[PDB]
Amino acid sequence: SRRYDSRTTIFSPEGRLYQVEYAMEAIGHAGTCLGILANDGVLLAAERRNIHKLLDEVFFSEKIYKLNEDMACSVAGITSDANVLTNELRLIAQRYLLQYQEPIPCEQLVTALCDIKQAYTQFGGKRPFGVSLLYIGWDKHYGFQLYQSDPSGNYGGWKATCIGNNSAAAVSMLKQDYKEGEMTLKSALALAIKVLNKTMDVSKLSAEKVEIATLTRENGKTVIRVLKQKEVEQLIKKHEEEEAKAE
């Protein structure tokens, strides 16, 4: 019926896809998720949004997801759509390992998902996926890599990027604080707390309100580890000490 159709996959008088733009506004109201590439590894630092006291911790992470043995991703937007896209990302990775028997290159995995996202924006008559993902990983072609994808199906590699609430302010601070070629996971795990301490206006980082994951290569094996709350608390403590010292 033409009367009840919303016509999601169509252009606007100014060459604009409004369903995609409206979905991007949704992403800008979700928990801040920051990714920083260092010379020794890559990190994803998301702001926990499920912080009620009657919530049970029953999983490895709420925002970070392992898609391969060498790749992981954080999501900002609609959680339900992220569960769909993360399951598809995991299958694309397994389908490649079956055909070639080698782990999937990182940009190849991001392109596959962005091709699916772009298809929902051109044909089908269905809404786009309101989820922007930050992907971290390591391959034997380009090494440690960080990528960002949007509901438009448009992806890009970054040295440091943020998605979610107060994302613009974060990118600004990362731009004036990131030293390309001179970043160690220690200085990376430090700028993360600094940016989160400014993006998350809600009081100060409380460790329970943040999640931090690191991807590193140890003895020819990629290891993804979500820092324990003890480690995150020590990081937040050091940041407070440093700021006070500079005062």
């Binding site: 159709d5 252009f11 060459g15 996202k117 772009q118 044909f123 089908g124 269905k126 890009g156 440091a160």
Partner: protein, 232 residues
């Protein structure tokens, strides 16, 4: 299957969905292509350097095959879909004919796809215009343009995207046998054309050259700076 007609005629005979697609191309970055005697040059404006962004991932100049390469203005996601379809097509052609596709063969296919999306149910026109540039087996330098309508024409030099009219006006008065005799002169013609629109100059201008019987070459930022100074 969703089978509504997205692209339909309007009183006055105007397919507005196709016109809206061209508005998206006009919002795209400026892409300039000059066809020389032994070198075809394609240069794109790197809007914002980003500083914290790997450039290898946001390149708007690609190679459909060993002899063909294209630049685009408009939606980057729609372009990736068109580039992949054309890359697969070039290989299918080599398998059914055992010869490299001709520049116009691939331009015809990319246009025919961009056209079927304007007369097929459940689809929106592609919001991208391309500049397919290559060298035919005879060795003739080739430059073609595709529109979101599926229309394609050969050009000696053209410009797509934001500030296309200004850049094309410049190329209309600065294109001659003189500014094409030297490969360096051809490269500096594209550089000057973009510099008319690009404000940063040198820092925000990607450029690529495909000489005869040679792969696409992406000029390094230092090499671009050399010409930008010589062109000053």
């Amino acid at each position: 299957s969703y089978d509504r007609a997205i692209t339909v005629f309007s009183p006055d005979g105007h397919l507005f969905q196709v016109e809206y697609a061209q508005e998206a191309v006009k919002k795209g970055s400026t892409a300039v292509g000059v066809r020389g005697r032994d070198i075809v040059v394609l240069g794109v404006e790197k809007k914002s350097v980003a500083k914290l962004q790997d450039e290898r991932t946001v390149r708007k100049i690609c190679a459909l095959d060993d002899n063909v390469c294209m630049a685009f203005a408009g939606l980057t996601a729609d372009a990736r879909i068109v580039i992949n379809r054309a890359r697969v097509e070039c290989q299918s052609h080599r398998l059914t004919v055992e010869d490299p596709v001709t520049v116009e063969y691939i331009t015809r296919y990319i246009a025919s796809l961009k056209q079927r999306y304007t007369q097929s149910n459940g689809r929106r026109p592609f919001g991208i215009s391309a500049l397919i540039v290559g060298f035919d087996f005879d060795g003739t330098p080739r430059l073609y343009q595709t529109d979101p309508s599926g229309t394609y024409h050969a050009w000696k030099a053209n410009a797509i995207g934001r500030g296309a009219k200004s850049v094309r006006e410049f190329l209309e008065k600065n294109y001659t046998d003189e500014a094409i005799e030297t490969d360096d002169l051809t490269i500096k013609l594209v550089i000057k054309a973009l510099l008319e629109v690009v404000q940063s100059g040198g820092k925000n201008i990607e450029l690529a050259v495909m000489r005869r019987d040679q792969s696409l070459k992406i000029l390094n930022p230092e090499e671009i700076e050399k010409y930008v100074a010589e062109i000053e």
